[PDB]
Amino acid sequence: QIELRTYVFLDSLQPQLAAYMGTVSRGFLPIPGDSCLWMEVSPGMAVHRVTDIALKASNVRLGQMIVERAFGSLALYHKDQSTVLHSGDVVLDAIGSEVRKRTKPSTSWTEVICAITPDHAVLINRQNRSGSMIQSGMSMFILETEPAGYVLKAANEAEKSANITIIDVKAVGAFGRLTLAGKEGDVEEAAAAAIRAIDQ
């Protein structure tokens, strides 16, 4: 009685999100245009069997896999949507679940902050930061969701919709966080897109 908690499909990874996920991935690496499936199941120890099923079902490659007590996560990459989707479906059949059984994203913090200062920028740039640098004077959008993975979708759509800089995209754990920066207007556009993407 494994259960699905998160399912997030990304048809095509935007440039920065691809570079970002490429930076933090601990398995195979994604490249721009790759399709990506992010899943989360409980209990966490079940992620291994799910991973094995996914990898044997197709040519999809494994980018990430994290085991915690309560939940486990994995990320799958391939240039073909169909390959990614097929592996998803085989997994879903094997555990007797389906997309709609996933928990929906609830956003618990959404905010734009203007003209960040140099001290604030250093701390942002230093602490577990895997994307690009924020420069003081920039504006910033921050977003938190639960479950965590859905933040990948917000990030991709945000990037599709505006000229901004990806700073960090935390998709692991119970809480998803997105941080992006740039000119205030672009940032406000990205924020709207991000929130919109979560609302579905």
Of the listed pieces 10-18, 80-88, 97-105, 155-163, which binds a second copy according to CB under 8 A? 10-18
> What is the nearest approach in angstroms of a second copy to the Cβ of residue 183?
13
Check binding of 131 to a second copy (CB under 8 A): yes
Which residues on neighbouring strands pair with residue 177, listed in sequence order? 144, 170
Which residues on neighbouring strands pair with residue 124, listed in sequence order? none
Q: Where are the beta strands (DSSP E) in 43-78?
A: 61-67, 72-78
Check binding of 163 to a second copy (CB under 8 A): no
Of the listed pieces 3-11, 25-33, 91-99, 155-163, which binds a second copy according to CB under 8 A? 25-33
Which of 116, 183, 184, 188 forms a contact with a second copy (CB under 8 A)? 116
Of residues 56-115, which lie at the interface with a second copy (CB under 8 A)? 56, 61-62, 64-67, 69-70, 107-113
Which of 11, 15, 80, 93 forms a contact with a second copy (CB under 8 A)? 15
Rounded to the nearest 10 degrees, the angle between the axes of helix 150-161 and helix 15-24 is 140
Of the listed pieces 4-12, 50-58, 88-96, 156-164, which binds a second copy according to CB under 8 A? 50-58
> What is the nearest approach in angstroms of a second copy to the Cβ of residue 105?
14
Q: What DSSP character marks residue 60? A: -
Instruction: Collect contacts of 78-81 with beta carbons under 8 A, ≥24 apart.
Output: 78/34, 78/35, 79/31, 79/33, 79/34, 79/35, 80/35, 81/11, 81/12, 81/35
CA gyration radius, the chain: 17
Quick one: 100 or 103, whose CB is closer to a second copy? 103
Token representation of residue 123: 């701390």
Check binding of 177 to a second copy (CB under 8 A): yes
Quick one: 99 or 114, whose CB is closer to a second copy? 114
Give the distance from CA 15 to its chain's centroid.
14
Quick one: 6 or 16, whose CB is closer to a second copy? 16
> What is the nearest approach in angstroms of a second copy to the Cβ of residue 142?
5
Check binding of 200 to a second copy (CB under 8 A): no
Whose CA is closest to 64, among 143, 193, 169, 144?
169
